[PDB]
Amino acid sequence: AAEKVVVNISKVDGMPWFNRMGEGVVEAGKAFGVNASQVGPSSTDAPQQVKIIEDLIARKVNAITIVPNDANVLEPVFKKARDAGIVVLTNESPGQPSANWDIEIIDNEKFAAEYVEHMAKRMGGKGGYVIYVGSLTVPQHNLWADLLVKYQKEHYPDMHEVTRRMPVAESVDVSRRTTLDLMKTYPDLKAVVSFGSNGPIGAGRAVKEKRAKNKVAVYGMMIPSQAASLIKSGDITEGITYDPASAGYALAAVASTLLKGEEIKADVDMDKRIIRFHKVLLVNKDNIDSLY
Ligand SMILES: OC[C@]1(O)OC[C@@H](O)[C@H]1O
């Protein structure tokens, strides 16, 4: 008979991050004997993900995996997928109610700690910072940001957010303009953190334009090839982030296991429904050339 069908859904198409994720999805399909694909929505508007899922339910797929733009917007349609007998997995949505499992490639608490310790060392434990998130509701960016700020307050009291987190991390242009604006406004701004993959690109371009790389550090999630030029020029300080092909691969792998009626085999937290690895990738001037 035909292979079972596994479909991943990214946050939005046309992104290096999600093209790399898709490579992992497709490779896992070959590895595990499932018909695996990835659909990229036209925008980050969460209803576009809902519409894709409705289409996939209609087409009777076996598993749907997804990087949610908004956990709560998707809950009703995830319930409909589960009612249809479809396995639903998320990445970047710990605690998603209606997903069989959420998969993460890093440990949230350790990841936030690493951001703060890296930032504090370069800032001497003192100064302003800002966080960019993809949106005000996207799940993981906001959990990571929460943990970062909490950790900072409990370790380095002389560091401080210059503003509330800014929902700009999915746009290079907007991230760039925001960074220019903040650098002009806040003399003590010493670091920009972006949890979305486009934000370090925009921030790094702003820092470059203002010739500010020794004053304003840039950290965040990123694809090495996208960030390489700015890393080399020193305008992006460091990527603290993971290989999204691992996420794509793990999603399709776990789907395959469930579809084969097998028990899950990482930290597997049964009651929280989270499968977690700890595969942090640091991206810096010393290793950039090894990474793309
Ligand atoms: O730009 C896409 C993205 O937001 O960046 C990193 C990761 O969180 C991913 O979902």
Numbering used by the authors: 27 to 291, 302 to 328
Task: Recite the paper's sentences.
For example, we recently identified the accessory ʟ-arabinose uptake (Aau) system in the attaching and effacing pathotype enterohaemorrhagic E. coli (EHEC). Aau is encoded widely by EHEC strains on a specific genomic island and is activated exclusively in response to ʟ-arabinose-mediated regulation, enabling enhanced growth on this sugar and a competitive advantage in the murine gut. In addition, substrate binding proteins (SBPs) are typically encoded at the same locus and capture target substrates, dictating the specificity of the cognate transporter. Here, we show that Aau displays a > 200-fold higher affinity for the monosaccharide D-ribulose, over ʟ-arabinose.
To test this, we overexpressed and purified a recombinant His-tagged version of the SBP from the EHEC Aau system (AauA; locus tag 0432 from strain ZAP193) by metal affinity and size exclusion chromatography. By contrast, incubation of AauA with D-ribulose resulted in a dramatic increase in Tm of up to 16 °C. To verify and quantify these findings, we used Isothermal Titration Calorimetry (ITC) to gain insight into the thermodynamic binding properties of AauA. Titration of ʟ-arabinose into AauA showed a weak binding affinity (KD) of 598 ± 132 μM for the sugar, whereas D-ribulose was attributable to a >200-fold greater affinity for the protein (KD = 1.98 ± 0.3 μM), indicating it is the likely preferred substrate of the system. To investigate the mechanistic basis of these distinctions in substrate affinity, we determined the AauA crystal structure bound to D-ribulose. The structure of AauA revealed a two-domain architecture, which is typical of other periplasmic SBPs. At the interface of the two domains, additional electron density became evident during refinement, allowing us to unambiguously model alpha-D-ribulose within the binding pocket. The sugar is sandwiched between Trp43 and His167. The ring of alpha-D-ribulose stacks against the indole group of Trp43, and His167 forms hydrogen bonds with the hydroxyl groups at C2 and C4 positions. Additional hydrogen bonds are formed between Glu118 and C2 and C3 hydroxyls, Lys37 and C3 hydroxyl, Glu196 and Ser223 with hydroxyl group at C5 position. Six different conformations of L-arabinose were docked into the binding site, and while all conformers occupied a similar binding position as D-ribulose, the predicted binding mode of L-arabinose exhibited fewer contacts within the substrate pocket of AauA. This could explain the weaker affinity of AauA towards ʟ-arabinose, since modelling of AauA in complex with this sugar suggests that it would form fewer hydrogen bonds in any configuration over D-ribulose.
